[PDB]
Design an enzyme around this catalytic site. Sequence first.
Site, mmCIF file in Angstrom:
data_model
loop_
_atom_site.group_PDB
_atom_site.id
_atom_site.type_symbol
_atom_site.label_atom_id
_atom_site.label_comp_id
_atom_site.label_asym_id
_atom_site.label_seq_id
_atom_site.Cartn_x
_atom_site.Cartn_y
_atom_site.Cartn_z
ATOM 1 N N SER A 43 21.228 -19.529 -42.591
ATOM 2 C CA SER A 43 21.242 -18.526 -41.524
ATOM 3 C C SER A 43 22.406 -18.650 -40.565
ATOM 4 C CB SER A 43 19.963 -18.549 -40.670
ATOM 5 O OG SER A 43 18.915 -17.904 -41.399
ATOM 6 N N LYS A 46 24.541 -15.555 -40.172
ATOM 7 C CA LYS A 46 24.175 -14.395 -39.363
ATOM 8 C C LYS A 46 25.129 -14.167 -38.201
ATOM 9 C CE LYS A 46 19.390 -14.663 -40.810
ATOM 10 N NZ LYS A 46 18.173 -15.521 -40.870
ATOM 11 N N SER A 103 16.337 -15.641 -36.020
ATOM 12 C CA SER A 103 16.691 -15.872 -37.424
ATOM 13 C C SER A 103 15.955 -14.908 -38.356
ATOM 14 C CB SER A 103 16.478 -17.344 -37.816
ATOM 15 O OG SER A 103 17.578 -17.723 -38.650
ATOM 16 N N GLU A 139 19.680 -11.766 -47.929
ATOM 17 C CA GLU A 139 18.462 -12.560 -47.732
ATOM 18 C C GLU A 139 17.385 -12.139 -48.722
ATOM 19 O OE1 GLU A 139 18.199 -15.085 -45.944
ATOM 20 O OE2 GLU A 139 19.616 -14.932 -44.258
ATOM 21 N N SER A 210 18.590 -23.037 -42.172
ATOM 22 C CA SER A 210 17.855 -23.946 -43.023
ATOM 23 C C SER A 210 17.642 -23.281 -44.372
ATOM 24 C CB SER A 210 16.541 -24.389 -42.383
ATOM 25 O OG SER A 210 15.691 -23.297 -42.219
#
Length: 260
Positions: A43, A46, A103, A139, A210
Site C-alpha cells: 500500500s 497509494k 489504506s 488491488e 503490508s
Amino acid sequence: SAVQQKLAALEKSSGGRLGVALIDTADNTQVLYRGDERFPMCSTSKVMAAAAVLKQSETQKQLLNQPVEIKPADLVNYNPIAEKHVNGTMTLAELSAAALQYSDNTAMNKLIAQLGGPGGVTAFARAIGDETFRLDRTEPTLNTAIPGDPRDTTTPRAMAQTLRQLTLGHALGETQRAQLVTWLKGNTTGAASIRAGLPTSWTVGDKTGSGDYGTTNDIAVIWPQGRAPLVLVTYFTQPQQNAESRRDVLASAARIIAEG
C-alpha cells in the site's frame, strides 16, 4: 558506520530482509541500508496514485470534487471507507483521503482507473524523475510480494527521493503539495510503525503497507521540533509466504536512525 552496523544487527535478529533510506534535508545527507534493492511496495504505492491525481488537478481545477460511483462490484478485500458509500458516490478527494489514511483498496482502484490503469501511475513517477518505481497490478493482487518478482516494487533510495519531491519539494503545485501533506499527517494506520520509534513531539506524516511474505512497510516525512525535516523509508519482507507482520522492526529501525 555505526548506524549501518545496528541496522544489520536488527535485520539479523528479525530473520527478514530490511531496506532503509533516510534523507536529512538539513544537509541533503543520506543513510542507506539495502538502498538499491527492490522491495514490494504494497500500500505504500497509494501515495503515488494520489499524487498523480493531484497533479491532474493542477489543470483540471475542479477534479477533486468530481463524484465517482461506488458499486458493489467495485469492492475488493479491504474497503473500510468505500463500504460506507456503496450505491452512493465519493469525490476524488474523498477517495484519495480514504486510500491514504485508511489504506482503502477500493479507493486505490478508483484512483488507478482515473489515471488510465497502472501504466498511468507509473507514467507519473517517470514524469517526476523516478525511473525505479513500477506499478503493474491493481488491488489486491499487487500485494503478492513474491520473492524476486519485480512487479509492483521500488527501492528505498528511489522512494525516499520521490517522497521528498512530492511533500517538501515542488513536484506538485503549492495547493496540491499542502493537501498531500495534510493527508499524510492524518494517517490512521501508522501508530505502531515508524511513529513508534520516534520522539512523541515530532510530527510525522506516513503511509504504511503490508502484504504477503510478512511484508511490512512504512514511508514517512518527519518534522522534528526546531530542526529541518527528514524523509524516512523502511521496507521489510520475510522468507515465509504466511509470515506475520513485523511493525516492531520498522519502529526499531526508526529508533536506530533517530539516535543519529
